[PDB]
Description:
Layout: E1 4-9, E2 12-13, H1 31-45, H2 47-50, H3 55-68, E3 77-79, E4 85-91, E5 109-115, E6 118-123, H4 130-140, E7 154-160, E8 168-169, E9 186-188, E10 200-202, E11 223-224, E12 227-230, E13 233-236
Antiparallel strand pairs: 1-6, 1-7, 2-5, 3-6, 4-5, 8-11, 9-10, 12-13
Helix pairs in contact: 1-3, 1-4
The chain binds one RNA strand of 62 nucleotides through α1, α3 and β4.
Amino acid sequence: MDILLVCLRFPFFSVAKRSYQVRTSFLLPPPSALKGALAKGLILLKPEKYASSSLDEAALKAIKEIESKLVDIKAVSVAPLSPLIRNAFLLKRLRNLESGSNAEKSDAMRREYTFTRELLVAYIFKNLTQEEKNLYLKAAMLIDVIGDTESLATPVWASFVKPEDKKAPLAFSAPYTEIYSLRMYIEKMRVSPEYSQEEIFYLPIEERRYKRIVYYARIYPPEVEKALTVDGEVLGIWIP
RNA sequence: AUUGAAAGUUGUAGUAUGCGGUCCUUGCGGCUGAGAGCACUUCAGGAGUUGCCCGCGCCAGC
């Protein structure tokens, strides 16, 4: 079990929830976006068998193959090691997909962007073959964007380091199943990308009344039997 | 190539046009750098010293 661990340094990201007008940005990246991020790496890097006539079909094939080798559909999670905040921008995001308004209609559209310096996201891979493991190491890098195109995310580092069974408080995100079994934040993040399903996840960021903006913090849930280390500091990760 | 795919919150706009920090005003009037004062008093340009000693206006001239 070689678990992928990558760190992304980005100014902002604007993956949002289902809402009209306002697109409320997710507090933490959903697993579907995270898995599509490296499914793009799969389809670009070795398009010999993972590229098809349709971009949607090739992306779906990559998603199916990448999820076949995960321990669970709810596998990937992020780690808010830097604090998170939310800002809003009124842009000229013209709305012309709804019925009417032709093609020359442009109106004020408010989009929410989440700011955090860096995040640590881990993909859980189960006994992947070495020959494809080298390609998957390469695909861990070049995670260019997360969600909206203007969410430029540059992966500073990526590696395959085994958890080696430590005990640490939870830092990476986890589904709202082990958290209940043992400052509460619950969300739905659509585990799988929707193409032409929904699960409940815990969120380990709490409020701090430090300034005018309330911003986000750490919750450190109780001990987990498995843990993963980065540069000598241990953090909690859970796997079914 | 992922709550995804395309998406200027934009185009025109003098914080301007006029306005003496100005007019009158002796740094002026009176005032000895003045009054008393020997650059004086005593002094030989003085003592001694030959303008010396020798010398035919000379011999022949009716």
